[PDB]
Structure 1
Amino acid sequence: AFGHHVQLVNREGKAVGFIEIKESDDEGLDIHISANSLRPGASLGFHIYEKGSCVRPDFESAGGPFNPLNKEHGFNNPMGHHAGDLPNLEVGADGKVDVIMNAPDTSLKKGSKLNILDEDGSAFIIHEQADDYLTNPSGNSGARIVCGALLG
């Protein structure tokens, strides 16, 4: 079961839902993401970045794609695949998303190369537009608009 609660904040620092994570059996991690205040009906880029720091207003700070296998971006890229690349989120008429997805190339185990919960942590970020699953570095998914820091 599902732990490591992370609070999601938007560019204006408002709380806009949460993520929790299960070490799956298996494999990789299952990510339960339940967010609100997003653009009704949009497909939005959604990735794991290499530092657990969510500082307004652009979240540059930080980092990273989470990319321990040094690949380039995108499911569709013949030279793809960052480990922190996740499917687009599909926002309801609601403006909400509430789904569980699998992130097969990640782990929470200390000493795994795919461990996202290192000393520096990681960040889950939702982008303003759809990831095209091909362009580097981030699929042309535009601005980072929601961020949740995973620390520990």
Structure 2
Amino acid sequence: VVETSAFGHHVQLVNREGKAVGFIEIKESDDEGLDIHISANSLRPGASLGFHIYEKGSCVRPDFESAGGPFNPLNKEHGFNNPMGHHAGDLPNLEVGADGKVDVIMNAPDTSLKKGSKLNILDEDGSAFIIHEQADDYLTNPSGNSGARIVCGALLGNNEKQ
């Protein structure tokens, strides 16, 4: 009939235009690196639905103490090979095209998300996942965007003591 997720409490990845409405379904395992199922869904356009750890707190920081986010200025050109050039700041491997079925669970640096605390990989910005600044929804007419903060999902664990 219907199914259900595993664990709870996660950073939902939704977009005002992306249409995405998945979530960060992490299911700590016990093998190597990680074995979570962080992949959004409910999309269509070749837009993005989040980004790599590059945000300060999940919708809990305006702009003052180290903005963070991506790098480089606006720069809205993107040319496979132009005289101007472009870089932006790298793009996440999750820009629709497969139902946002992008689950990273193969070879990891140090994703000890099975230590016994969801994701004990709290380093500067644990796991940040901002769902914005990307879209490229070829619509222009309704209410697309192609760059604008609306959703987020940066849940960077916090820990500190003497």
CA 1:90–1:79 in 2, change beyond 3 Å: closer, same or farther?
same
Q: How far apart are residue 151 of structure 1 and its match?
A: 6.2
Q: More strand per residue: 1 or 2?
A: 1
Cα deviation, residue 47, structure 1: 0.3
Moved more, 2-11 or 64-73: 64-73
Please, what TM-score do these two structures have when normalized by structure 2? 0.42
1: CA distance between counterparts of 2:141 and 2:131?
17
1:18 Cα offset (Å): 0.8
Query: Displacement, 1:33?
Result: 3.0
Gaps in structure 2 of 5+ consecutive residues? 1-5, 158-162
Q: Which deviations, in whole Å up to 9, do the C-alpha atoms of 1:42-62 show, x marking residues without a partner?
A: 467730236332259999986
Secondary structure at the counterpart of residue 147 of structure 1: coil
Q: Aligned-residue CA RMSD in angstroms?
A: 9.0
Q: Which is greater in Rg? A: 2
Structure 1 length-normalised TM: 0.44
Residues in 2 aligned to 1:28 and 1:76: alpha-carbon distance in whole angstroms: 36
Tell me the alpha carbon deviations over residues 126-145 of structure 1, each in whole angstroms, 9 at most, x when there is no partner. Answer: 45549999999999997666
The share of aligned pairs that are identical, in percent, is 100
1:97-125, CA deviations, whole angstroms, 9 ceiling, x for partnerless residues? 67867654322367999943479754223
8 A contact 1:31–1:101 mirrored in 2? no
Contact 1:28/1:107 (8 A) holds in 2? yes
Q: Name which of 54, 70, 80 aligns with 1:75.
A: 80
Unaligned runs of 5+ in 1: none
User: How far, CA to CA, are the matches of 1:97 and 1:14 in structure 2?
Assistant: 16
**8 Å CA contact retained: 1:12, 1:57:** no
Shift of 1:32: 1.6
Q: Is this contact kept in 2: 1:65–1:82, CA < 8 A? A: no
Alpha-carbon spacing, 1:58–1:104, altered in 2? closer, same or farther (3 Å): same
Aligned residues: 152
Q: How far does residue 66 in structure 1 lie from its aligned partner after superposition?
A: 13
Tell me the CA shift for residue 19 of structure 1. Answer: 0.5
Does the CA contact (< 8 Å) of 1:131 and 1:138 recur in 2?
A: no
